[PDB]
Amino acid sequence: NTQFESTAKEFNKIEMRIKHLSDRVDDGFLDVWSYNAELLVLLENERTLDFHDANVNNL
């Protein structure tokens, strides 16, 4: 459940440092979401296969 996404990330010509701050802010969230998404899928996939094994063993 996400907040409204915006594309307004433009600053004037003499504010390139502020643009760089915006650029690295999005880089930080890109790294956070990518790493968490990768390990979420890897962890859940291993647990899902274990879930089927437990169900088979329980029968």
Partner: protein, 162 residues
């Protein structure tokens, strides 16, 4: 919500010329025209013009104006007939003062002079006023608009809306 409206009756200013044009802004045909919402006023002759307005609408008003930076004394004299021309526009409690500036710039679109554009927002039941002795492009038209909380931005593309 977004409405263009007429905000200033330019005919009420005397001893001055309005609706001035230039060949740098042609029609679709060709020739000399100017921005629809911005009224170029010339030949103030040093005289001072006063205007007042109240936003009695239930929406904030967006107004855009311009300040003329002439190239030299001769160009200033031809357009306005005086080596003066300064505008103070007040929106609510902010004061914006644009003193006369005379300076050459590199020629773009046949212009060594410049018209620099500014804007402001007049909230409902708030006022704005203009005091000008020349070198001003008036906000004859403005947009009444309704803000939304979720800000989107601008999509840069050559495609058409499907």
């Amino acid at each position: 919500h977004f409405r263009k409206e007429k905000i200033i009756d330019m005919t009420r200013f005397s001893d001055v010329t309005t609706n001035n044009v230039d060949s740098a802004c042609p029609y679709d045909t060709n020739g000399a025209s100017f921005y629809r919402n911005l009224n170029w006023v010339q030949q103030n002759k040093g005289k001072q013009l006063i205007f007042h307005y109240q936003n009695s609408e239930n929406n904030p008003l967006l107004i855009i104006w311009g300040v003329h930076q002439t190239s030299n004394a001769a160009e200033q004299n031809t357009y306005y007939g005086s080596q003066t021309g300064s505008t103070t526009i007040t929106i609510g409690e902010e004061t914006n003062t644009y003193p006369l500036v005379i300076s050459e710039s590199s020629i773009l679109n046949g212009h060594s002079d410049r018209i620099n554009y500014f804007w402001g927002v007049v909230n409902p039941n708030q006022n704005f006023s203009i005091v000008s002795t020349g070198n001003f492009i008036w906000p004859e038209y403005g947009y009444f608009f309704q803000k939304t909380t979720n800000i989107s931005g601008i999509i840069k593309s050559s495609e058409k809306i499907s």
